[PDB]
Structures are given as C-alpha cells and as structure tokens.
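Example with several molecule types.
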Amino acid sequence: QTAVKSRKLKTGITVELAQDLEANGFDAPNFLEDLLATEMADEINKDILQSL
Amino acid sequence: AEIGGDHGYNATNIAAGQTSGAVTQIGPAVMGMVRRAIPNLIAFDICGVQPM
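Resulting structure tokens for the full complex:
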C-alpha cells in the first residue's frame, strides 16, 4: 500500500509573445499546451526509468 | 517566464529577425511596393507631325 504523489508544472507567457507567435504560424494556445504535455510525459520517463 | 522580447529597432536586426527574447521572427511582412510615377508627355500637335 502506497499513497500517491504529485508532479506539477507551469510555464507562463506574455500576451505580446502570444500575439506575435500567431504571426509566425504557430497556434499559440495549442502550441503551449503541447509543451507541458510533452515535458510532463517526458519527465515521467526520467522517473519510471530511474525508478527501475 | 519566456518574455516575448522585441527587435532592438535596428534595421540590421529587424530585417534578419534577430530578437531579444524568444521565438525569433521568420521575417518582416510585405506591405507593398512603391515605384516612381511616369511623367506625362506634351502632345506633339503643337508642332508639325508629318509621318514619313
């Protein structure tokens, strides 16, 4: 029996960055939410593999 | 947290897209092209016009 634990991440941007990000082609909201999903999933591997 | 930054207001930097923060710009836009106007001609009917 083991109590669960927590992993938390937060990035934050500024409106000016998001405004000009659109002009370069990136979908500024969708791109950023991909970053956290990519990093968090990636950071679990560094946990699971080092847990083995 | 990943400031947008800005161009240093240097025509050298602005054209190339060199920024200060993150997400360096692909490049400027294209607002259009201005070319010199065509001077108008004084009608030759003032003097003799005899097609050879």
